[PDB]
Symmetry: C2
Subunit: 95 residues, 2 copies
């Protein structure tokens, strides 16, 4: 399977916060779905190498490297390495 | 040394949130002072095996597993495995 998503914790009503663990197979590309205005997303690489397209530009992130950005803007996740990439996606929804 | 701490992101003023990576050497024990009242913490194991003491009780956590708990309680981290343990710690402060 190209992309396997698993919540690390259930939806957190108090913190308005989701925390997902995602494994992206070699060669897989995933485009973000739309989010509510004001959502903030953090991506942190756990293992492997991840390519993130943010503000129309690609960058490579290595383990324990991360990026914080506007989750409501189009972005993409891509694995151009030869092994799965495991990363976390944290989402803070606005109050 | 026994414990190596690294911020994954700098302090987030708007989200009142810290995010750290920690590596505990075999046999290491870290006893934290309780954080401010209302603080919520999450811990996720990246690799290895982590023991955590919450509510005066020890439990062992493995990769992909995590726990959410009240940060203003006393708690502790310990590595009783023969390998280092690498984990992430999230801290959310009250707004
Ligand atoms: Mn702590």
């Amino acid at each position: 399977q190209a992309m396997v998503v698993k919540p690390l914790f259930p939806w957190d009503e108090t913190l308005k916060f989701d925390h997902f663990s995602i494994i992206l197979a070699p060669g897989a590309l995933s485009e973000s779905t739309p989010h509510e205005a004001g959502v903030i997303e953090h991506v942190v690489v756990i293992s492997g190498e991840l390519e993130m397209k943010i503000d129309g530009e690609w960058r490579t992130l290595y383990p324990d490297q991360g990026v914080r950005f506007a989750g409501d803007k189009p972005h993409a996740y891509r694995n151009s390495s030869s092994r799965p990439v495991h990363f976390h996606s944290l989402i803070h929804y606005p109050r």
